[PDB]
């Protein structure tokens, strides 16, 4: 419950482009980056009760903490979709449409 879009791209320059473009259009809180396992922990801490769509760009972080994101999310009841794509326009359209369509999430009481 409470879903995030995990944007993985081999092209860090493309991550930077889409990130700032989506932060231009939407609040730069809904767009977030992971730079460490510790950062990710703080993300998923929020997303348990925070029932709005998030977008985490794997910027500088590694596959070990990417899987730690998936694990901590699946145990803490945070929903996610793993988006593995490299394209500045396509990533912008997927990020933004996610924030638009998941703008209406179901209001279930969170395990607090």
What share of residues in the chain are helix, strand, coil (percent, to 5)?
45, 20, 35
DSSP 60-104: S--HHHHHHHHHHHHHHT-EEEEEE---HHHHHHHHHHHHHHTTS
Give the C-alpha separation, 14 to 17, whole Å: 5
The method recorded for this entry reads NMR
- First vs last Cα of the chain: how many Å apart? 13
Number of other residues whose CB lies within 10 A of the CB of residue 60: 11
Complete domains list, the chain, with CATH: 1-112 (3.40.50.11230)
């Amino acid at each position: 419950m409470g879903k995030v879009l995990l944007v993985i791209s081999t092209d860090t320059n493309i991550i930077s482009s889409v990130q700032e473009r989506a932060k231009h259009n939407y609040p730069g809180r809904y767009i977030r980056t992971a730079t460490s396992s510790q950062d990710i922990r703080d993300i998923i801490k929020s997303m348990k009760d925070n029932g709005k769509p998030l977008v985490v760009f794997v910027n500088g972080a590694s596959q070990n903490d990417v899987n730690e994101f998936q694990n901590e999310a699946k145990k803490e009841g945070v929903s996610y979709d793993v988006l593995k794509s490299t394209d500045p326009e396509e990533l912008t359209q997927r990020v933004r449409e996610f924030l638009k369509t998941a703008g209406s999430l179901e209001h279930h009481h969170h395990h607090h």
